Amino acid sequence: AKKILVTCALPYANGSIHLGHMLEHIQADVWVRYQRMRGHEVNFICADDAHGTPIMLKAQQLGITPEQMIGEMSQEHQTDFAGFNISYDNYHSTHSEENRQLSELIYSRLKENGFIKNRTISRDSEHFFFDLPSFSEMLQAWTRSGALQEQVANKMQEWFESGLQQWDISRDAPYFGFEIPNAPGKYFYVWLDAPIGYMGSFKNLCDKRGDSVSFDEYWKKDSTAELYHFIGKDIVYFHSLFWPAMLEGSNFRKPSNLFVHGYVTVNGAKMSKSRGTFIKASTWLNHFDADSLRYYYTAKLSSRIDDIDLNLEDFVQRVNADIVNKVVNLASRNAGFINKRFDGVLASELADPQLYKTFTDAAEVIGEAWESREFGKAVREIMALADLANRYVDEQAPWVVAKQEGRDADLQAICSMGINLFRVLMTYLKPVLPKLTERAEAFLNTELTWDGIQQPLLGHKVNPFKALYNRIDMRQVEALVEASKEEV
Numbered sequence: 236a237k238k239i240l241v242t243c244a245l246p247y248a249n250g251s252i253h254l255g256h257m258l259e260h261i262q263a264d265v266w267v268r269y270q271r272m273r274g275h276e277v278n279f280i281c282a283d284d285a286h287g288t289p290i291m292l293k294a295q296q297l298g299i300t301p302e303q304m305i306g307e308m309s310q311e312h313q314t315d316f317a318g319f320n321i322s323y324d325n326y327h328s329t330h331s332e333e334n335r336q337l338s339e340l341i342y343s344r345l346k347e348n349g350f351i352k353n354r355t356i357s358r359d360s361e362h363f364f365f366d367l368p369s370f371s372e373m374l375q376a377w378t379r380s381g382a383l384q385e386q387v388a389n390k391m392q393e394w395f396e397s398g399l400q401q402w403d404i405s406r407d408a409p410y411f412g413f414e415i416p417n418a419p420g421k422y423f424y425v426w427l428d429a430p431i432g433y434m435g436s437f438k439n440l441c442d443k444r445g446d447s448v449s450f451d452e453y454w455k456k457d458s459t460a461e462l463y464h465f466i467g468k469d470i471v472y473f474h475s476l477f478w479p480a481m482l483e484g485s486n487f488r489k490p491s492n493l494f495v496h497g498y499v500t501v502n503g504a505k506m507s508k509s510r511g512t513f514i515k516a517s518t519w520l521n522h523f524d525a526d527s528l529r530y531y532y533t534a535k536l537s538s539r540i541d542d543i544d545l546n547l548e549d550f551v552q553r554v555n556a557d558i559v560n561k562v563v564n565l566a567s568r569n570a571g572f573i574n575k576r577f578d579g580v581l582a583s584e585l586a587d588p589q590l591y592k593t594f595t596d597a598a599e600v601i602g603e604a605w606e607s608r609e610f611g612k613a614v615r616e617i618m619a620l621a622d623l624a625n626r627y628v629d630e631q632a633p634w635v636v637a638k639q640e641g642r643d644a645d646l647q648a649i650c651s652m653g654i655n656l657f658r659v660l661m662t663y664l665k666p667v668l669p670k671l672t673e674r675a676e677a678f679l680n681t682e683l684t685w686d687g688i689q690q691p692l693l694g695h696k697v698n699p700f701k702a703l704y705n706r707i708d709m710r711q712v713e714a715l716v717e718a719s720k721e722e723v
């Protein structure tokens with residue numbers, strides 16, 4: 236039973252959540268749900284990044300105060316993430332008392348430890364700098380400790396060779412942010428308090444739970460808890476250099492690892508407003524469900540930093556072929572005979588213990604795939620099993636055994652076997668498709684657990700069910716694109 240704290244980058248409170256942002260939150264959510272399925276203590280945390288010029292600029296545009304805007308933005312963001320079933324344990328804000336206190340604490344410790352330097356610059360003004368260069372050797376060692384992604388470890392080497400420089404962490408009024416203690420008119424640069432927002436969001440969660448020990452257990456220097464940050468390749472510098480150094484210099488633990496992902500493209504190109512491929516998360520949900528996108532992204536994700544392409548044409552074909560025709564089909568083609576011919580009761584023995592064992596034996600490799608973030612590999616393995624299950628059903632041909640008087644026992648054995656194979660597949664896909672999983676659990680009259688597959692459902696009553704998942708079509712994609720054009 237590990238203790239894990241997982242975060243997603245904090246979205247700026249200056250715009251709506253789009254499909255690009257969703258790649259990150261969905262990737263993290265699938266991993267998080269799998270970790271919870273394996274029994275670990277997981278804390279999935281996020282928050283809105285509500286300070287700085289990005290927010291100040293937007294607030295000005297629509298003539299509204301930052302506090303009012305960030306409030307509305309926070310609500311809109313959370314509604315969208317909830318719509319995609321991103322299971323955060325806490326979604327907070329960088330503009331909070333928790334973040335202010337922790338930002339002041341870390342700043343005070345850095346200054347006291349001699350890592351803060353002061354210098355004037357050009358109109359003139361005194362600024363405060365973080366002495367990142369004094370952490371080079373430690374960062375080098377940490378970088379080479381076999382944790383980071385190869386592509387990331389290599390990118391950092393380029394940065395180390397270019398030489399680390401002191402970082403300007405102060406900004407002058409007027410600025411929407413936290414005031415620097417003992418420095419009138421000076422504010423902390425947004426990127427200084429933003430990552431501290433991870434800590435602020437966790438402190439908020441601990442305080443809400445009335446938990447007075449967890450914060451220190453997770454952030455103290457010799458913590459045995461694991462800390463992971465899911466981020467895009469454009470903010471790796473802040474998370475791999477500035478951030479770990481800020482923590483080191485203030486007596487806090489550094490990240491256990493950074494999980495970096497690439498960018499989402501649509502139809503092979505960067506999202507385009509004029510073409511209707513710049514799609515907002517809220518707009519997507521008006522046309523499709525969350526599971527469809529979660530599945531598509533997951534099928535293409537890996538442990539590398541490669542870009543992920545949402546080919547709209549391929550989207551419809553893949554969702555129907557895999558979810559509808561392979562997985563769900565396994566249940567619908569066997570459930571009829573069971574509910575009508577056997578009052579929903581499954582057979583008392585496995586018709587083919589061998590085949591079932593093949594399915595449960597795959598748990599090791601599939602679980603390792605979810606764990607290592609090789610999502611594409613996990614999906615390929617799962618669909619390979621689905622093909623196997625559907626082939627079994629074809630060979631046994633229940634529709635033939637159905638019209639053969641006196642073969643009821645054989646029929647129930649065949650169809651129950653298929654439903655049990657479906658049970659295993661839905662368990663492996665549970666981290667990916669939260670809603671379909673709930674519908675499957677209602678049908679099976681069972682909660683799906685990772686170890687539960689070792690015990691197939693025998694002499695078990697299943698419920699009748701309406702379509703678990705309907706096919707989607709290109710007309711819906713056309714509507715989505717047209718709607719997206721109209722919003723621009």
Ligand SMILES: Nc1ncnc2c1ncn2[C@@H]1O[C@H](CO)[C@@H](O)[C@H]1O
Nearest residue numbers: 244245246255256466467497498499
């Ligand atoms: N088009 C995109 N594809 C994937 N991630 C994105 C995209 N645009 C922004 N992000 C991610 O959103 C996070 C900020 O909310 C960053 O980690 C960033 O990399």
Ligand code: MET
Nearest residue numbers: 244245246247284429430
């Ligand atoms: C603490 S992660 C902050 C990420 C930043 N808001 C970005 O949108 O890039």
